Design a protein around this ligand. Sequence first.
Ligand SMILES: CC(=O)OCC1=C(C(=O)O)N2C(=O)[C@@H](NC(=O)Cc3cccs3)[C@H]2SC1
Ligand SMILES: *CC1=C(C(=O)O)N[C@H]([C@H](NC(=O)Cc2cccs2)C(=O)O)SC1
Length: 358
Amino acid sequence: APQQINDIVHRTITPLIEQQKIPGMAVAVIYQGKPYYFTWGYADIAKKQPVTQQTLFELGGVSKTFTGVLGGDAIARGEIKLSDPTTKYWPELTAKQWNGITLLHLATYTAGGLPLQVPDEVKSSSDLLRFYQNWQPAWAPGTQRLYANSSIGLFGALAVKPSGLSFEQAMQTRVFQPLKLNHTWINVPPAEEKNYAWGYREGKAVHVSPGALDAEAYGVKSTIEDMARWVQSNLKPLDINEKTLQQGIQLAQSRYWQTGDMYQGLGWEMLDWPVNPDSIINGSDNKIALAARPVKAITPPTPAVRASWVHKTGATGGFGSYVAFIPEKELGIVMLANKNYPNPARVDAAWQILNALQ
Ligand SMILES: CC(=O)OCC1=C(C(=O)O)N2C(=O)[C@@H](NC(=O)Cc3cccs3)[C@H]2SC1
Ligand SMILES: *CC1=C(C(=O)O)N[C@H]([C@H](NC(=O)Cc2cccs2)C(=O)O)SC1
């Protein structure tokens, strides 16, 4: 644990925890292929259980990076194509607005305004079909980006049907197991509950509630060790032995669309490095509930750029997560907290840390 890394991480995170009143936090810095872990506070305040390297945190939207890579793996296997129409995988979506919407649109939030959330009244696949059939796009496909669980969530659900596996089984067998993410879960087993941190919202202990397409959009729980391995796998996909997975990881970091200085991948989002911190820090901000932005197509998509700031923020009611890495510098960071705090503070801290290390 280089004193440099230790100091940079502690001088940045200690103040963060104090200002945001975060009960528990785990951080991992990946530098030149080696992970350095740091933990603070509590996983369960009432039971005085500390955060450890085995503590499970709710990833929120960081889960979309796993969905994007699993999709990328299915593409590499020849099971699906992003140019495929959505109806190929759900023929029952007969409403006229679905002609023209492809798996690429679903995966990149460009289908035309699918909503951020699937309504809580949706409790079955029949309800889900009704929801999508009744949805009225605001825009033509491929014209504007609107971040949405109902978009990438449907992509995840459709992408695995050719495999014959359920989304969870596909994720476990094609991504978690090959990468040795053995303490990463869509459903936390009873044996692992002792390590499942409580999230805190307004001082109350909370866990994410079950919902339609939750696994696909915001339902993964993981430890700081597994997340560091996830970041390393995305930093250096050539070291991965499973061919289609290696390719899938690379596909998720392709640049499909541009809005401002940001590029949309499958799950992952990217900016050219070096990046103005005010374009990424101020860039990530959920203080805004709906931010519709025109997108420019990258025709054809740019293959994964090593000189990139690749990242993803995530939140649930009681957790706040952030992952960012720079392939060209073999540098990455994971920050997991059991309080959902402002996105800009997460980005500012990660930038201060990675910038200091190169
Ligand atoms: C739309 C937007 O930019 O706002 C930030 C956001 C994020 C994020 O990237 O931090 N997302 C997540 O991490 C998801 N979170 C949830 O869906 C929260 C829950 C839905 C149901 C129970 S918790 C979405 S909720 C929306
Ligand atoms: C395409 C598609 C289908 C289908 O072709 O019938 N069904 C999916 C279904 N999902 C669920 O049963 C779980 C849900 C509960 C609430 C919302 S979905 C499945 O298991 O394949 S949905 C996509």
